[PDB]
Amino acid sequence: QPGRFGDIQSRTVESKDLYANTALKLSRPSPGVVHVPYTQTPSGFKYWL
Amino acid sequence: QPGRFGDIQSRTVESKDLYANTALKLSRPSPGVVHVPYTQTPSGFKYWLKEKGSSLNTKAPFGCKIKTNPVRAMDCAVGSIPVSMDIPDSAFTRVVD
Amino acid sequence: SVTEHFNVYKATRPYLAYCADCGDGYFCYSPVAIEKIRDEASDGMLKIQVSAQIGLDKAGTHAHTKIRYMAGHDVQESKRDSLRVYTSAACSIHGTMGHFIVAHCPPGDYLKVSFEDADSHVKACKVQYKHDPLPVGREKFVVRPHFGVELPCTSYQLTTAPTDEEIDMHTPPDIPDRTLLSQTAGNVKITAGGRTIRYNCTCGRDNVGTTSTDKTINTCKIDQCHAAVTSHDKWQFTSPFVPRADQTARRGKVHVPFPLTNVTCRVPLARAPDVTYGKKEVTLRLHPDHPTLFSYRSLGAEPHPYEEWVDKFSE
Amino acid sequence: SVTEHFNVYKATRPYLAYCADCGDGYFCYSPVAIEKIRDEASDGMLKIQVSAQ
Amino acid sequence: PPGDYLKVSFEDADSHVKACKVQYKHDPLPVGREKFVVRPHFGVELPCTSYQL
Amino acid sequence: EYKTVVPSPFIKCCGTSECSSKEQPDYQCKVYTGVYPFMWGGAYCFCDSENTQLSEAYVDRSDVCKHDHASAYKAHTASLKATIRISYGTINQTTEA
C-alpha cells in the first residue's frame, strides 16, 4: 500500500518485474509553464527506515 | 481593552474619531541618551490575526459554505421550501392525447 | 520616471542616529540606524527604514549604485553593492529608495541592516525583531513551488511613485562638536571651517558665532565653552533618537515608497491523502512536507470541528 | 582517466530550465535548475543535479 | 550567537580557506530575568562579567 | 493595527518646557527635568542640569488601515435567496427566487 513498507515489491533483487502501488497521479501543467506536475506518496521504505 | 481585539476602534474606515486604549506609557530617557523611551501593549489586532484559528467556513453546521462581499452562508442543507405552482393548461396534454 | 521620484530627497540629508547594538554587542552613533520595521504585507515582505539614504548621490541626484550617509558633519557616499540585510540568514533585497528597504527574510528573532563605509569598513545596526510570518494558505510552506494554487495576498509594490504614506521632515538640531574649539595661548580658536557655529563661552561673546573663525580674545579655555553647528541647509527625519530643533510644524515631508498592493501568492497543494473506508470510518494517512492544516466537520446539525496542524506523517 | 571520464559530456549542452525560486522569492530561468537531490548515502552526503555543467 | 558548533577559519597565504570545527553547545544563560536577544536602547544596567579587551 | 506617533524629543537646553494637553488618542506627554543628553560630537547642552526633555507620544490609525482592517458587525434577519431549476415537458430553465 502507498507510503507503507512494501509499496514497491520485487520477488528477487535481480527480478525484472516489479509491483508498485505508490499512488502516482498526474495533474494539469500550470498555465504558461512546461513542467509535468504530479503527486505521489513518499517512499514507504524511506518512511520505514 | 489593550492587547485584545478592538484595542483601537473606529466607527468607520474613514472616521475622524478614534477610540484607542493601548496602555501607552512614557518613561524617562536614560542618562545621556536621546530616544523618548516608552512601553505600550502590543497591537490586539496583530494578536487576533494569529489567534484567529480557522474561520466559520470550516465550522458552520449543515455544511454551509461561508463567503464574504456580501456575508452569506451558501448551500445550507437545512429545512424545506414550500412551493406554490401556477401551471397553465398549455403545459399539460389532454387525456385524449 | 524614477529621477523625478527620488528628487524629493534632494531637500534632505541622512543622519547619524543612536543605534543600541551595531552588530558588535555594543552601541555607537550609526549611519544605518534602523528606525522602524513595517510588516503588513501578507506575503511577509519587510519594509525597513534606516537613517541612510539609498540610491542618492552626495548632491541628492538619483544614482542606482550609491548610498549616502553621514560621516560626521559631512555627507559621504558609498556603493549600494555593499547593502546587506540579515535575520537568521541573508535576506533578499527587492527594492531600495532613500531611507527605505523592502526585503524578503527568513524567520528570525533579530534583524540586522549593514553596508560598507567609503573606507570599506562595515557599518551596521541590529534590532530585536521576531519575524515569523503567518502562512498565506493552510500550509506553512518554505519555498515557492513549480505547481500549486494562486491564493490572494498583499505585497509592497516595487514602484517608487509618490504615495499617501509620509514621514515628517524638519531642520536638524544644533549638532555639537567640541573639536571646533581649540586652545591658542589661553584664547579659544573657533575653527568654523565652512560651517555656521553657535557658541557660548561664559567669558566670551556667546550667541551665534557666525561663519569664519573667532579668536575669543581672553583666557576662557575649552572649559566653560561650547560650540555647535547650526542653520543647516537640509532637513532630517524627526526620529526619536535625534533632538528636535524647535516645536514648530514640520518643514516638509517625504513619502513612504513601495505601496501595499493586492497580489496572488503561489501556495503548494498537499498530497491527496491515502484513504480507506470502514463501517462509519474514513481512515486518512497524511504525508505532509511541511506543517499542513488538517480539518474536518460533520455536515449535520451538530458539527464537531476538528483542526490539527499536521507536521508529521500521521494517520 | 579524468579527461576520458569527462569527455562523455562533449556531446552535450547545459540548458535553461524553469525554476520556481531564484533565491529571491520569484520564478527564474536559471542555468542551475536543481533537477533532483539524491540522498541514498547513509552518512548524509547529498548528490545534487543542476542544469549547469 | 547560540548554536551547536564552533568553526574558526581563516585564509592561507595562497587564499585557500583553512578551518577547524568543533562541537560546542553555546546556550548562554541570560543576565537577569529575561532571555533577551538584542541590547535595547533603554533598560537596566545589571552587573556581570566579561573578558577585558 | 495602531500606529504610535513619537516625534523627536523637544530637549530644551538651559531652560524648561511645560507640557500641554491635546485631543489625540491615548496621548501621553511628560517633561523630564535634569536631562544632560549627548550627541555624537559631545554633550547636547551647555547647562549640566538645567535642561528638560519634553517627551510626547500618541496613538493613530495605521497608514494601511484603509486596506487591512476587520469589521465588527451585528448580524441578524437573514434573507434566503435560492436558485431553482424548473423543468417539465419542453420547459427546462433556471431561475433565481
F40 contact C CB<8A: yes
What residue of F is the nearest CA neighbor of B22? F26
Q: What is the dihedral of CA F58, F60, F62, F65, to 10 degrees?
A: 160
Nearest to C240 among B35, B62, B77 (CB): B35
User: Given an 8 Å threshold on Cβ–Cβ distance, is C145 in contact with D18?
Assistant: no
In angstroms, the separation between the Cα of residue F14 and the nearest Cα of chain C is: 12
Exposed (0-12), middle (13-18) or buried (19+): which is C206, by Cβ within 10 Å? middle
Give the closest residue to B9 by CA, choosing from B40, B54, B43, B51.
Answer: B43
| Separation CA C91–CA C89 (nearest Å) | 6
Q: Which chain C residues touch D23 with a CB distance below 8 Å?
A: 92
Tell me the sheet residues that pair with F88.
F91
Contacts of D29 (CB under 8 A, 6+ apart): D16, D17, D18, D19
Q: Resolution to 1 decimal, in Å?
A: 3.1
Q: Which chain D residues touch C92 with a CB distance below 8 Å?
A: 23-25
Half-sphere exposure of D48 (CA within 13 A, CB side): 10
| Separation CA F97–CA F80 (nearest Å) | 9
Fill in the DSSP letter of residue C214: B
| Separation CA E37–CA A43 (nearest Å) | 41
C193 contact F CB<8A: no
As a whole number of Å, the CA-based R_g of chain B is: 29
Tell me the sheet residues that pair with F3.
F60
User: Given an 8 Å threshold on Cβ–Cβ distance, is F4 in contact with B40?
Assistant: yes
AA identity, residue E40: P
Q: Please, which experimental method was used?
A: cryo-EM
Fill in the DSSP letter of residue E8: E
User: Given an 8 Å threshold on Cβ–Cβ distance, is E41 in contact with B37?
Assistant: yes
Do the beta carbons of residue F49 and residue F36 sit within 8 Å?
yes
Give the closest residue to B44 by CA, choosing from B93, B96, B2, B87.
Answer: B2
Q: Do chains D and F touch (3 or more CB pairs under 8 A)?
A: no
Exposed (0-12), middle (13-18) or buried (19+): which is C169, by Cβ within 10 Å? buried
**Cα C158–C160–C165 angle (5° rounding)?**
100
Q: Which chain E residues touch B37 with a CB distance below 8 Å?
A: 41-42
| Separation CA B44–CA B24 (nearest Å) | 13
| Separation CA C282–CA F60 (nearest Å) | 51
Q: Do chains B and F touch (3 or more CB pairs under 8 A)?
A: yes
F38 contact B CB<8A: yes
Q: Which chain B residues touch F75 with a CB distance below 8 Å?
A: 71
| Separation CA C144–CA D23 (nearest Å) | 10
C90-119 burial, b at 16+ Cβ within 10 Å, e below that, comes to ebbbbbbbbbbbbbbbeebebbbbbbbeee
Give the closest residue to F37 by CA, choosing from F11, F6, F7.
Answer: F11
| Separation CA C152–CA C113 (nearest Å) | 30
In angstroms, the separation between the Cα of residue C154 and the nearest Cα of chain A is: 22
Sign of CA dihedral C141, C147, C153, C154: positive
User: Given an 8 Å threshold on Cβ–Cβ distance, is E38 in contact with C126?
Assistant: yes
User: Given an 8 Å threshold on Cβ–Cβ distance, is E40 in contact with C110?
Assistant: no
Q: Cell numbers 543542476 correspond to what residue? A: D50
| Separation CA F43–CA C175 (nearest Å) | 10
Q: What is the dihedral of CA B40, B41, B43, B46, to 10 degrees?
A: 130
Copy the grid coordinates of residue B12: 468607520
Nearest to A2 among C146, C274, C313 (CB): C274
Q: Which chain E residues touch B33 with a CB distance below 8 Å?
A: 41-42
| Separation CA D15–CA A33 (nearest Å) | 16
CB-CB neighbours of C307 under 10 Å: 13
Q: Which chain E residues touch C27 with a CB distance below 8 Å?
A: 39
Residue C113: enclosing H or E segment and its boundaries? strand C108-116
User: Given an 8 Å threshold on Cβ–Cβ distance, is C244 in contact with F41?
Assistant: no
Do the beta carbons of residue C124 and residue C61 sit within 8 Å?
no
Q: Which chain A residues touch D18 with a CB distance below 8 Å?
A: 33-35
Give the closest residue to B30 by CA, choosing from F56, C30, E36, F34.
Answer: F34
What residue of C is the nearest CA neighbor of B54? C307
What residue of F is the nearest CA neighbor of C165? F63
Exposed (0-12), middle (13-18) or buried (19+): which is B89, by Cβ within 10 Å? exposed
| Separation CA C159–CA C297 (nearest Å) | 44
The count of residues in chain D is 53
| Separation CA C239–CA C245 (nearest Å) | 12
F40 contact B CB<8A: no
- The number of C-beta contacts closer than 8 angstroms across C and E is 20
Tell me the sheet residues that pair with C294.
C308
Give the closest residue to C132 by CA, choosing from C217, C65, C46.
Answer: C46
Give the closest residue to C286 by CA, choosing from C298, C299, C296.
Answer: C296
Q: Which chain E residues touch C20 with a CB distance below 8 Å?
A: 38-41
| Separation CA B47–CA C99 (nearest Å) | 28
Per DSSP, the three-state class of C3 is helix
- Three-state SS string across chain D, please? CHHHHHHHHHHCCCCCCCECCCCCCCCECCCCCEEEEECCCCCCCCEEEECCC
Give the Å distances, CA to CA, from D52 to A34, C314, D30, D34: 19, 38, 9, 9
Question: β-strands C28-30, E17-26: how paired?
Answer: unpaired
User: Given an 8 Å threshold on Cβ–Cβ distance, is B58 in contact with C297?
Assistant: yes
Do the beta carbons of residue C245 and residue C174 sit within 8 Å?
yes
| Separation CA D17–CA D26 (nearest Å) | 14
